[PDB]
């Protein structure tokens, strides 16, 4: 077919397969929920078979994943590596101590969610997320990206 | 047809330096007990063109920092690395360079500036000092990689990269000079900045500016040199067997020894911790100069002693 | 020329793709060890460009001074790097 | 496990101990 | 002086074998068998035409075809 | 000695700001900045129950999960003058020791990422996965189980469970044995490592280390041999005692306690009792579920427990155990309230970050990253 | 010995159905294996069991086509699975 | 298993041995079917010219006793 | 009993062992036929769609309120489950329905509050709350994370089949 419709379209697929088979997280590594992402690294649930890489710096990261309390100190830095990272870029909260509060929600030195500072795309739940959680969530922003259609609102713009 | 001949040597080496990366995310897999990346396309032959894609697209985002640096930096990498394997003499070689070695080792050396461009260009504190480590370390190694050479062609008889294949007609140029290769393979190494010699860009270097598009360009560099250095190996020291009627055989061969040397140092990188930045320096100039320079005089001395000058031409 | 157009391919590959990037995505030297080390980079670069005529010089008739001359290149050299290693040289 | 008995002889000599004895593999 | 050899063989494990190197391709060329060779396999080898003297008489050199048995050989180059 | 803020994604726990002065490579003066991850945990637990605060001390220091929980069971039943059942000491001992083995695995493996060694980490991190497992099949959490509770365990073992720390156990060593063959004598761990961060017999004790800290510069002193908690009295160990204290020295002690661990859970298998998990005084320990859902005395004492508390009696007590780190120890001053007054958790951690300066002097950059491994620092504790 | 490994992988090829039939699988999973079937739910799911592989891989459950009529062919999702068969994957309960 | 690493290999290395070969039949058509004549020396290029200069307008094409 | 873990003549043979140690790099080639071993070994890993890490029945999970399987609700709002929850994720307000009986009006988990202890699983007398087996509930926005009456009686509903399971083999253990 050659309706640019359909010439878009498919490139925006294109586009949206790229960024979503390979993303490259980083992580904060904010208390515990580290622990749980660190077996997702590891040998039973591998995050590289996705294309998820196991590590990479601000500059080269796609996804960041705040793993743990964004305690008022951090809530700083947090915003700054976000505002590091390049234009297509994506926060996926981990833990019930970053989703929200968590069990410290009440406290006077942790922030109630990092929503509050970073824009949140995916929200992973429990208190140690379970790795397969975090999977099904890093394999969720990857439906959310390839539902993204950055190209044709271009074109019906 | 000679444009013909410039994309083959090119396009087939961008597309194998694309398929290193593949071949390095599931060999260092499988070492650790994991797949690697088989999901994306089938086993995973997708995966690299994926990243370069997102990598593209994402924002060059030039920080700022000195602009023009930031990006000759990484074109003078791709293309100081792609340039080299213009002489390499798989079988025939491209152009055929009567000085060729000398033209590998000199187009090395330019290598080292990309590293202190980018690291100047990044505006950092930290950066700066980051490309320090590495042209530091580029020079210096550079120092035995010369000698290394200059040992191997007084058994040569000459420069050029075609002569060996000649030189190496009965035996290997590792049964004999095999302790400078051993200092040949430590040296590409170091000089690709693989593992157990990467402390640059451990943490603490060129790249922390860079993302997307220039990252890939150097990236792409790294690569590309992962195999020439490996594959200079796979000439120098392993020569693969040449029989005139039929030139392939050497190629085949080539193919054969440049992938296991190559596989060589993604197994050493899964194996090892990576060096001190003095216990780098440490090694090149206690370690292995003082036994490359005296090797090097064994070889002005073999050749004379054992009336064996080899034949120049 | 032959060379020069594998280059410019070269170069233009290269310069193709960082721009694709970009239009596509629409002080302190303490270390004067660092300076000694690259201080000695050049010497021994310097003694490198000496000992590279070596191949050609191979084949020359004399052969005695060759070696004689040679032998006494790397000697005086390595000796200038043994003296690196007993000051606080090389030893960053 | 499945070493087909050369696989795991490499596996064995490059080890220097037998994997065969402590697999990776759990099983029923 | 056993030992200055003997820790210095087991650590420090370079210097002795790089010094023992120096040394024997200094001495190796003093005594040998065929250090000589290299002078002259080097010397014989034709690179510049041997331009021909004119034969005012009384002289050994190879006249004509350059076969004659007189003149220089290599003989020694060959079963070298 | 230009300040370089080296720190936060850096090769500490999230949280270092360690400010440092480096006259090029070389280290001037290291102070490290905490709290990055202070979130509370001490004045959060004054609200709550002690039950209902039995959670935070898992997070304190989440790589040693439970060992952690054994430190206030410990605590508050000291303050109660109730002592859990055999059965529950054996599980707290079982589960005390694999919960070591899982900080050490997380210790050297981590060590040597930073250090840039990557295989061993994925090896023993599917070992480490297998252990997880045991939790969730024992309390149901993966990590952050609070399965150790201040009467005892929650709930006895699955039926079946010990079966299988035993086959771990059986084969766990080989696993430690292959990482070794990587990195005990590689020619370049060695070097990393060795004559880093020596710290004296004096010193060690002045500034408070007491843990493989103390152990590794010679010190015998393992508070589980001098002063016995649970029943791990009964059982028999040797301390990994080291000399030449360094980074190498001390490593090779975790690797021998992760040996002798396994000793310790091998004997543990062989000798748990028959009996109860959890103390039989409906005072202490909530009610079988059975027993509420049949007897009045039990439902009152289930619906005062859960909703109020233990009300334990006025008191102050410094507890410490043996966690992975070294002496995790909680000063819990009680009023007679079923919520806790204070609860100052000593952490293993505090005191040896703040060695960092003392140890890592005249020391390169790539100096400092060893020594934070060599602390098995989590910023959990240190911040808490 | 390694002939035996070959069969084993012609047979895994030709047992998922014709050339086209492995393509399927081949793409959505990237793993081949054979398996005897233990179920098939109402919503469209195919569940396999293998006692000779390991823990972790020994259950797999084949995803179907529009299960809710949600084009799932190639966004497979971890929550298609039913309530029901979602223990016997995860080796809750050993019972199909 | 590790049979899996083999799929990349194969790409690698069948993109290191066209380069070879290559390089090794396009001068063999592109030099009258012989090797492309490797002009080291002043000597050999003389010769090669010579040989230019000897018949037609390209050095392959060699003239034989039968001139 | 204590060990010592690193507490410590010169020949040729031994130092030429030691040289040859330190020259042809001999224990650097050790390490590497380690990695090589496992090269070998069956990788570890799970296809993390189709195949899935086990979980057995104290696994706590997804909160769910269950009902009778006559069809009423379990709960009776006693509220100590909003008394016990360590997080204060339980919110409940309640009033005497129709019929007379003891409901809640409102039951609001906030899950992102919540740290999974399980301690509301324990409290219940009822046991009306339960840790439910599934931990896949990622969700885009926030609120959703929030969870009222109806979301979790909705999730008690879709589950009930496997939590009784769960419930069926581990009580007998509590
Ligand atoms: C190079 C030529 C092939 C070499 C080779 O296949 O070695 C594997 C072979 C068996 O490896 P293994 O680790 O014992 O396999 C585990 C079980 O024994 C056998 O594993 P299994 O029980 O799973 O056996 C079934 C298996 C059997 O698979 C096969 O043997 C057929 C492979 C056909 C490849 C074309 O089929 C599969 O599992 C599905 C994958 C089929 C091949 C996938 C990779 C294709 C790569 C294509 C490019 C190369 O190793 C050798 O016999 C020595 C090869 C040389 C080593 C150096
Ligand atoms: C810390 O530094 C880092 C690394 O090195 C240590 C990494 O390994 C990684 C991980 C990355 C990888 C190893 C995979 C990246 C791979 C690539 C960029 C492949 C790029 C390939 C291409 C450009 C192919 C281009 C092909 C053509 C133009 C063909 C033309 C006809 C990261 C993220 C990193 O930051
Ligand atoms: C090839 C032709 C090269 C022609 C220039 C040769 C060098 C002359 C000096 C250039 C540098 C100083 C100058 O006058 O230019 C300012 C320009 C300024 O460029 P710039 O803007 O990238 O540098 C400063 C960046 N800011 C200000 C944002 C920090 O110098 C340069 O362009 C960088 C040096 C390279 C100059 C061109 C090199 C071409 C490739 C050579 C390999
Ligand atoms: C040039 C380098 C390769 C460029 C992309 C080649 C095709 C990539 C592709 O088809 O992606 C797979 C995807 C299908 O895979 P998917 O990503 O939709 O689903 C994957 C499901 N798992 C992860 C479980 C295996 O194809 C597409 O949906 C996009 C195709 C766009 C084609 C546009 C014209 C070309
Ligand atoms: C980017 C910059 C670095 C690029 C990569 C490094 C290039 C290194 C070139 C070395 C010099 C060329 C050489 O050594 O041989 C050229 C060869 C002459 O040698 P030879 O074949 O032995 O001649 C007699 C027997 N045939 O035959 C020739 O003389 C061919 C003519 C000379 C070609 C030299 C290379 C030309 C490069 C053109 C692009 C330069 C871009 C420079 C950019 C920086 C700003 C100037
Ligand atoms: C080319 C020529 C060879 C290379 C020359 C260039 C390098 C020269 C280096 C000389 C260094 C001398 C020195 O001071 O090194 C002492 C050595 C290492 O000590 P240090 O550097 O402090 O390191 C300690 C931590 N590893 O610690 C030692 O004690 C090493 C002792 C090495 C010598 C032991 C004997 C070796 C065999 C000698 C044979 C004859 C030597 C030549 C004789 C010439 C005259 C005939
Ligand atoms: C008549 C006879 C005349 C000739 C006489 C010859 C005598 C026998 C030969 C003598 C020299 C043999 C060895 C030469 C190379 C090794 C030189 C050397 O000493 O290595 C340096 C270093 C030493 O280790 P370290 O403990 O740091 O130093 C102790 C002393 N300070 O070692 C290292 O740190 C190595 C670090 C390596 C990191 C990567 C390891 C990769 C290993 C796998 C690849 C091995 C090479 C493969 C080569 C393939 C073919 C090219
Ligand atoms: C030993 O210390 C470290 C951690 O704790 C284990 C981390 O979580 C992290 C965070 C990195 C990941 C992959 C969670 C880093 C960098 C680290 O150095
Ligand atoms: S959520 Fe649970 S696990 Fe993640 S950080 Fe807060 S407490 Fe630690
Ligand atoms: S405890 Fe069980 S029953 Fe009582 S309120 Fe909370 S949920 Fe409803």
Same mark, same amino acid.
């Given at each position: 077919?050659?309706?640019?419709?359909?010439?878009?379209?498919?490139?925006?697929?294109?586009?949206?397969?790229?960024?979503?088979?390979?993303?490259?997280?980083?992580?904060?590594?904010?208390?515990?929920?580290?622990?749980?992402?660190?077996?997702?690294?590891?040998?039973?649930?591998?995050?590289?078979?996705?294309?998820?890489?196991?590590?990479?710096?601000?500059?080269?990261?796609?996804?960041?994943?705040?793993?743990?309390?964004?305690?008022?100190?951090?809530?700083?830095?947090?915003?700054?590596?976000?505002?590091?990272?390049?234009?297509?870029?994506?926060?996926?909260?981990?833990?019930?101590?970053?989703?929200?509060?968590?069990?410290?929600?009440?406290?006077?030195?942790?922030?109630?969610?990092?929503?509050?500072?970073?824009?949140?795309?995916?929200?992973?739940?429990?208190?140690?997320?379970?790795?397969?959680?975090?999977?099904?969530?890093?394999?969720?922003?990857?439906?959310?990206?390839?539902?993204?259609?950055?190209?044709?609102?271009?074109?019906?713009? | 047809?000679?444009?013909?001949?410039?994309?083959?040597?090119?396009?087939?080496?961008?597309?194998?330096?694309?398929?290193?990366?593949?071949?390095?995310?599931?060999?260092?897999?499988?070492?650790?007990?994991?797949?690697?990346?088989?999901?994306?396309?089938?086993?995973?032959?997708?995966?690299?063109?994926?990243?370069?894609?997102?990598?593209?697209?994402?924002?060059?985002?030039?920080?700022?920092?000195?602009?023009?640096?930031?990006?000759?930096?990484?074109?003078?990498?791709?293309?100081?690395?792609?340039?080299?394997?213009?002489?390499?003499?798989?079988?025939?070689?491209?152009?055929?360079?009567?000085?060729?070695?000398?033209?590998?080792?000199?187009?090395?050396?330019?290598?080292?500036?990309?590293?202190?461009?980018?690291?100047?260009?990044?505006?950092?504190?930290?950066?700066?000092?980051?490309?320090?480590?590495?042209?530091?370390?580029?020079?210096?190694?550079?120092?035995?990689?010369?000698?290394?050479?200059?040992?191997?062609?007084?058994?040569?008889?000459?420069?050029?990269?075609?002569?060996?294949?000649?030189?190496?007609?009965?035996?290997?140029?590792?049964?004999?000079?095999?302790?400078?290769?051993?200092?040949?393979?430590?040296?590409?190494?170091?000089?690709?900045?693989?593992?157990?010699?990467?402390?640059?860009?451990?943490?603490?270097?060129?790249?922390?500016?860079?993302?997307?598009?220039?990252?890939?360009?150097?990236?792409?560099?790294?690569?590309?040199?992962?195999?020439?250095?490996?594959?200079?190996?796979?000439?120098?020291?392993?020569?693969?067997?040449?029989?005139?009627?039929?030139?392939?055989?050497?190629?085949?061969?080539?193919?054969?020894?440049?992938?296991?040397?190559?596989?060589?140092?993604?197994?050493?990188?899964?194996?090892?911790?990576?060096?001190?930045?003095?216990?780098?320096?440490?090694?090149?100039?206690?370690?292995?100069?003082?036994?490359?320079?005296?090797?090097?005089?064994?070889?002005?001395?073999?050749?004379?002693?054992?009336?064996?000058?080899?034949?120049?031409? | 020329?032959?060379?020069?157009?594998?280059?410019?391919?070269?170069?233009?590959?290269?310069?193709?793709?960082?721009?694709?990037?970009?239009?596509?995505?629409?002080?302190?030297?303490?270390?004067?060890?660092?300076?000694?080390?690259?201080?000695?980079?050049?010497?021994?670069?310097?003694?490198?460009?000496?000992?590279?005529?070596?191949?050609?010089?191979?084949?020359?008739?004399?052969?005695?001074?060759?070696?004689?001359?040679?032998?006494?290149?790397?000697?005086?050299?390595?000796?200038?790097?043994?003296?690196?290693?007993?000051?606080?040289?090389?030893?960053? | 496990?499945?070493?087909?008995?050369?696989?795991?002889?490499?596996?064995?000599?490059?080890?220097?101990?037998?994997?065969?004895?402590?697999?990776?593999?759990?099983?029923? | 002086?056993?030992?200055?050899?003997?820790?210095?063989?087991?650590?420090?494990?370079?210097?002795?074998?790089?010094?023992?190197?120096?040394?024997?391709?200094?001495?190796?060329?003093?005594?040998?068998?065929?250090?000589?060779?290299?002078?002259?396999?080097? =010397?014989?080898?034709?690179?510049?035409?041997?331009?021909?003297?004119?034969?005012?008489?009384?002289?050994?050199?190879?006249?004509?075809?350059?076969?004659?048995?007189?003149?220089?050989?290599?003989?020694?180059? =060959?079963?070298? | 000695?230009?300040?370089?803020?080296?720190?936060?994604?850096?090769?500490?726990?999230?949280?270092?700001?360690?400010?440092?002065?480096?006259?090029?490579?070389?280290?001037?003066?290291?102070?490290?900045?905490?709290?990055?991850?202070?979130?509370?945990?001490?004045?959060?637990?004054?609200?709550?129950?002690?039950?209902?605060?039995?959670?935070?001390?898992?997070?304190?220091?989440?790589?040693?999960?439970?060992?952690?929980?054994?430190?206030?069971?410990?605590?508050?039943?000291?303050?109660?003058?109730?002592?859990?059942?055999?059965?529950?000491?054996?599980?707290?001992?079982?589960?005390?020791?694999?919960?070591?083995?899982?900080?050490?695995?997380?210790?050297?493996?981590?060590?040597?990422?930073?250090?840039?060694?990557?295989?061993?980490?994925?090896?023993?991190?599917?070992?480490?996965?297998?252990?997880?497992?045991?939790?969730?099949?024992?309390?149901?959490?993966?990590?952050?189980?609070?399965?150790?509770?201040?009467?005892?365990?929650?709930?006895?073992?699955?039926?079946?469970?010990?079966?299988?720390?035993?086959?771990?156990?059986?084969?766990?060593?080989?696993?430690?044995?292959?990482?070794?063959?990587?990195?005990?004598?590689?020619?370049?761990?060695?070097?990393?490592?060795?004559?880093?961060?020596?710290?004296?017999?004096?010193?060690?004790?002045?500034?408070?280390?007491?843990?493989?800290?103390?152990?590794?510069?010679?010190?015998?002193?393992?508070?589980?041999?001098?002063?016995?908690?649970?029943?791990?009295?009964?059982?028999?160990?040797?301390?990994?005692?080291?000399?030449?204290?360094?980074?190498?020295?001390?490593?090779?002690?975790?690797?021998?306690?992760?040996?002798?661990?396994?000793?310790?859970?091998?004997?543990?298998?062989?000798?748990?009792?028959?009996?109860?998990?959890?103390?039989?005084?409906?005072?202490?320990?909530?009610?079988?579920?059975?027993?509420?859902?049949?007897?009045?005395?039990?439902?009152?004492?289930?619906?005062?427990?859960?909703?109020?508390?233990?009300?334990?009696?006025?008191?102050?007590?410094?507890?410490?155990?043996?966690?992975?780190?070294?002496?995790?120890?909680?000063?819990?001053?009680?009023?007679?309230?079923?919520?806790?007054?204070?609860?100052?958790?000593?952490?293993?951690?505090?005191?040896?970050?703040?060695?960092?300066?003392?140890?890592?002097?005249?020391?390169?950059?790539?100096?400092?990253?060893?020594?934070?491994?060599?602390?098995?620092?989590?910023?959990?504790?240190?911040?808490? | 010995?390694?002939?035996?490994? &070959?069969?084993?992988?012609?047979?895994?090829?030709?047992?998922?159905?014709?050339?086209?039939?492995? &393509?399927?699988?081949?793409?959505?999973?990237?793993?081949?294996?054979?398996?005897? &079937?233990?179920?098939?739910?109402?919503?469209?799911?195919?569940?396999?069991?293998?006692?000779?592989?390991?823990?972790?891989?020994?259950?797999?459950?084949?995803?179907?086509?529009?299960?809710?009529?949600?084009?799932?062919?190639?966004?497979?999702?971890?929550?298609?699975?039913?309530?029901?068969?979602?223990?016997? &994957?995860?080796?809750?309960?050993?019972?199909? | 298993?590790?049979?899996?690493?083999?799929?990349?290999?194969?790409?690698?290395?069948?993109?290191?041995?066209?380069?070879?070969?290559?390089?090794?039949?396009?001068?063999?058509?592109?030099?009258?079917?012989?090797?492309?004549?490797?002009?080291?020396?002043?000597?050999?290029?003389?010769?090669?010219?010579?040989?230019?200069?000897?018949?037609?307008?390209?050095?392959?094409?060699?003239?034989?006793?039968?001139? | 009993?204590?060990?010592?873990?690193?507490?410590?003549?010169?020949?040729?043979?031994?130092?030429?062992?030691?040289?040859?140690?330190?020259?042809?790099?001999?224990?650097?080639?050790?390490?590497?036929?380690?990695?090589?071993?496992?090269?070998?070994?069956?990788?570890?890993?799970?296809?993390?769609?189709?195949?899935?890490?086990?979980?057995?029945?104290?696994?706590?999970?997804?909160?769910?309120?269950?009902?009778?399987?006559?069809?009423?609700?379990?709960?009776?709002?006693?509220?100590?489950?909003?008394?016990?929850?360590?997080?204060?994720?339980?919110?409940?307000?309640?009033?005497?329905?129709?019929?007379?009986?003891?409901?809640?009006?409102?039951?609001?988990?906030?899950?992102?509050?919540?740290?999974?202890?399980?301690?509301?699983?324990?409290?219940?007398?009822?046991?009306?709350?339960?840790?439910?087996?599934?931990?896949?509930?990622?969700?885009?926005?926030?609120?959703?994370?929030?969870?009222?009456?109806?979301?979790?009686?909705?999730?008690?509903?879709?589950?009930?089949?496997?939590?009784?399971?769960?419930?069926?083999?581990?009580?007998?253990?509590?």
């Amino acid at each position: 077919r050659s309706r640019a419709e359909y010439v878009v379209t498919k490139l925006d697929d294109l586009i949206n397969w790229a960024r979503r088979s390979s993303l490259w997280p980083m992580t904060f590594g904010l208390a515990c929920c580290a622990v749980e992402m660190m077996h997702m690294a590891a040998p039973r649930y591998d995050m590289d078979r996705f294309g998820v890489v196991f590590r990479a710096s601000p500059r080269q990261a796609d996804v960041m994943i705040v793993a743990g309390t964004l305690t008022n100190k951090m809530a700083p830095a947090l915003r700054k590596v976000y505002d590091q990272m390049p234009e297509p870029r994506y926060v996926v909260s981990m833990g019930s101590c970053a989703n929200g509060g968590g069990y410290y929600h009440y406290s006077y030195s942790v922030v109630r969610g990092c929503d509050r500072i970073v824009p949140v795309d995916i929200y992973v739940p429990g208190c140690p997320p379970t790795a397969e959680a975090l999977l099904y969530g890093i394999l969720q922003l990857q439906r959310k990206i390839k539902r993204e259609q950055k190209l044709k609102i271009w074109y019906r713009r | 047809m000679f444009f013909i001949n410039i994309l083959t040597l090119l396009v087939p080496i961008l597309i194998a330096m694309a398929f290193l990366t593949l071949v390095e995310r599931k060999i260092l897999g499988y070492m650790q007990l994991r797949k690697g990346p088989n999901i994306v396309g089938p086993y995973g032959i997708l995966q690299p063109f994926a990243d370069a894609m997102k990598l593209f697209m994402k924002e060059p985002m030039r920080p700022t920092t000195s602009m023009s640096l930031f990006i000759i930096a990484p074109t003078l990498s791709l293309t100081l690395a792609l340039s080299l394997w213009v002489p390499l003499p798989m079988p025939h070689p491209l152009i055929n360079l009567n000085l060729g070695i000398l033209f590998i080792l000199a187009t090395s050396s330019l290598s080292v500036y990309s590293i202190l461009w980018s690291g100047w260009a990044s505006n950092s504190k930290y950066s700066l000092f980051g490309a320090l480590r590495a042209v530091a370390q580029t020079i210096s190694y550079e120092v035995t990689m010369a000698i290394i050479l200059l040992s191997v062609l007084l058994m040569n008889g000459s420069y050029s990269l075609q002569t060996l294949i000649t030189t190496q007609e009965h035996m290997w140029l590792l049964l004999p000079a095999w302790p400078m290769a051993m200092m040949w393979f430590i040296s590409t190494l170091a000089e690709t900045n693989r593992a157990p010699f990467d402390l640059t860009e451990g943490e603490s270097g060129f790249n922390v500016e860079y993302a997307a598009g220039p990252f890939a360009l150097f990236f792409m560099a790294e690569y590309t040199n992962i195999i020439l250095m490996n594959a200079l190996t796979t000439i120098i020291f392993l020569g693969p067997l040449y029989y005139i009627n039929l030139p392939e055989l050497y190629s085949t061969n080539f193919m054969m020894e440049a992938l296991l040397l190559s596989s060589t140092f993604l197994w050493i990188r899964a194996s090892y911790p990576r060096f001190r930045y003095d216990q780098l320096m440490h090694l090149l100039w206690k370690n292995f100069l003082p036994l490359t320079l005296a090797l090097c005089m064994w070889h002005i001395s073999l050749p004379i002693f054992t009336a064996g000058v080899p034949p120049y031409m | 020329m032959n060379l020069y157009t594998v280059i410019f391919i070269n170069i233009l590959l290269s310069l193709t793709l960082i721009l694709v990037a970009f239009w596509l995505p629409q002080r302190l030297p303490f270390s004067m060890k660092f300076f000694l080390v690259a201080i000695t980079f050049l010497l021994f670069d310097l003694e490198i460009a000496l000992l590279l005529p070596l191949p050609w010089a191979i084949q020359t008739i004399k052969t005695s001074t060759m070696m004689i001359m040679a032998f006494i290149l790397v000697t005086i050299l390595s000796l200038g790097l043994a003296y690196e290693w007993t000051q606080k040289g090389l030893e960053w | 496990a499945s070493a087909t008995r050369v696989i795991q002889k490499l596996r064995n000599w490059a080890s220097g101990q037998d994997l065969q004895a402590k697999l990776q593999l759990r099983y029923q | 002086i056993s030992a200055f050899l003997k820790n210095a063989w087991a650590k420090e494990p370079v210097l002795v074998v790089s010094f023992s190197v120096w040394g024997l391709a200094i001495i190796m060329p003093m005594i040998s068998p065929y250090t000589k060779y290299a002078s002259m396999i080097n =010397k014989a080898t034709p690179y510049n035409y041997p331009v021909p003297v004119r034969d005012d008489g009384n002289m050994p050199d190879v006249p004509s075809h350059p076969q004659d048995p007189l003149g220089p050989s290599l003989d020694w180059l =060959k079963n070298l | 000695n230009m300040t370089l803020n080296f720190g936060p994604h850096p090769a500490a726990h999230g949280v270092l700001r360690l400010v440092l002065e480096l006259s090029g490579e070389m280290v001037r003066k290291c102070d490290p900045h905490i709290g990055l991850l202070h979130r509370g945990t001490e004045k959060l637990i004054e609200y709550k129950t002690y039950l209902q605060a039995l959670p935070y001390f898992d997070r304190l220091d989440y790589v040693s999960m439970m060992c952690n929980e054994q430190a206030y069971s410990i605590a508050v039943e000291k303050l109660l003058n109730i002592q859990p059942p055999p059965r529950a000491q054996w599980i707290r001992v079982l589960f005390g020791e694999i919960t070591r083995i899982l900080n050490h695995i997380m210790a050297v493996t981590t060590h040597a990422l930073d250090i840039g060694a990557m295989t061993p980490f994925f090896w023993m991190f599917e070992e480490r996965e297998k252990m997880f497992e045991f939790y969730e099949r024992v309390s149901g959490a993966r990590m952050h189980a609070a399965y150790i509770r201040p009467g005892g365990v929650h709930q006895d073992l699955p039926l079946g469970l010990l079966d299988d720390i035993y086959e771990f156990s059986k084969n766990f060593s080989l696993r430690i044995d292959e990482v070794e063959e990587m990195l005990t004598n590689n020619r370049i761990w060695r070097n990393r490592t060795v004559d880093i961060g020596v710290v004296t017999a004096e010193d060690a004790l002045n500034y408070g280390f007491s843990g493989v800290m103390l152990r590794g510069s010679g010190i015998q002193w393992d508070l589980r041999k001098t002063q016995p908690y649970d029943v791990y009295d009964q059982v028999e160990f040797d301390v990994p005692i080291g000399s030449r204290g360094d980074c190498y020295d001390r490593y090779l002690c975790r690797v021998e306690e992760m040996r002798q661990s396994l000793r310790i859970i091998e004997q543990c298998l062989n000798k748990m009792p028959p009996g109860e998990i959890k103390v039989d005084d409906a005072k202490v320990s909530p009610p079988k579920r059975a027993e509420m859902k049949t007897s009045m005395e039990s439902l009152i004492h289930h619906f005062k427990l859960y909703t109020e508390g233990y009300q334990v009696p006025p008191g102050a007590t410094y507890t410490a155990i043996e966690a992975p780190k070294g002496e995790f120890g909680v000063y819990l001053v009680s009023d007679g309230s079923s919520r806790p007054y204070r609860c100052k958790i000593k952490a293993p951690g505090f005191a040896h970050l703040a060695g960092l300066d003392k140890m890592s002097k005249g020391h390169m950059l790539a100096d400092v990253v060893a020594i934070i491994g060599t602390q098995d620092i989590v910023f959990g504790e240190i911040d808490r | 010995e390694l002939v035996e490994v &070959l069969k084993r992988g012609v047979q895994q090829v030709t047992g998922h159905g014709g050339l086209r039939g492995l &393509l399927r699988v081949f793409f959505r999973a990237n793993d081949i294996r054979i398996g005897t &079937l233990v179920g098939e739910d109402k919503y469209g799911n195919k569940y396999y069991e293998d006692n000779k592989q390991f823990f972790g891989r020994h259950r797999w459950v084949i995803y179907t086509t529009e299960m809710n009529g949600k084009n799932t062919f190639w966004d497979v999702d971890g929550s298609m699975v039913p309530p029901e068969w979602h223990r016997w &994957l995860h080796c809750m309960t050993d019972d199909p | 298993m590790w049979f899996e690493i083999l799929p990349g290999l194969a790409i690698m290395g069948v993109c290191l041995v066209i380069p070879g070969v290559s390089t090794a039949y396009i001068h063999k058509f592109t030099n009258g079917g012989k090797e492309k004549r490797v002009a080291r020396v002043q000597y050999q290029w003389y010769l090669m010219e010579r040989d230019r200069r000897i018949s037609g307008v390209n050095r392959y094409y060699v003239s034989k006793g039968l001139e | 009993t204590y060990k010592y873990v690193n507490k410590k003549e010169v020949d040729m043979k031994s130092a030429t062992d030691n040289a040859a140690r330190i020259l042809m790099w001999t224990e650097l080639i050790r390490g590497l036929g380690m990695t090589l071993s496992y090269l070998f070994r069956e990788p570890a890993t799970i296809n993390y769609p189709f195949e899935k890490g086990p979980l057995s029945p104290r696994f706590r999970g997804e909160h769910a309120l269950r009902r009778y399987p006559s069809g009423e609700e379990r709960c009776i709002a006693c509220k100590l489950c909003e008394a016990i929850c360590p997080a204060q994720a339980i919110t409940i307000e309640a009033e005497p329905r129709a019929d007379g009986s003891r409901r809640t009006t409102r039951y609001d988990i906030d899950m992102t509050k919540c740290i999974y202890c399980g301690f509301c699983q324990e409290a219940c007398p009822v046991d009306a709350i339960v840790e439910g087996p599934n931990f896949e509930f990622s969700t885009e926005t926030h609120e959703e994370l929030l969870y009222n009456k109806e979301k979790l009686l909705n999730n008690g509903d879709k589950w009930e089949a496997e939590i009784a399971a769960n419930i069926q083999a581990d009580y007998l253990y509590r």
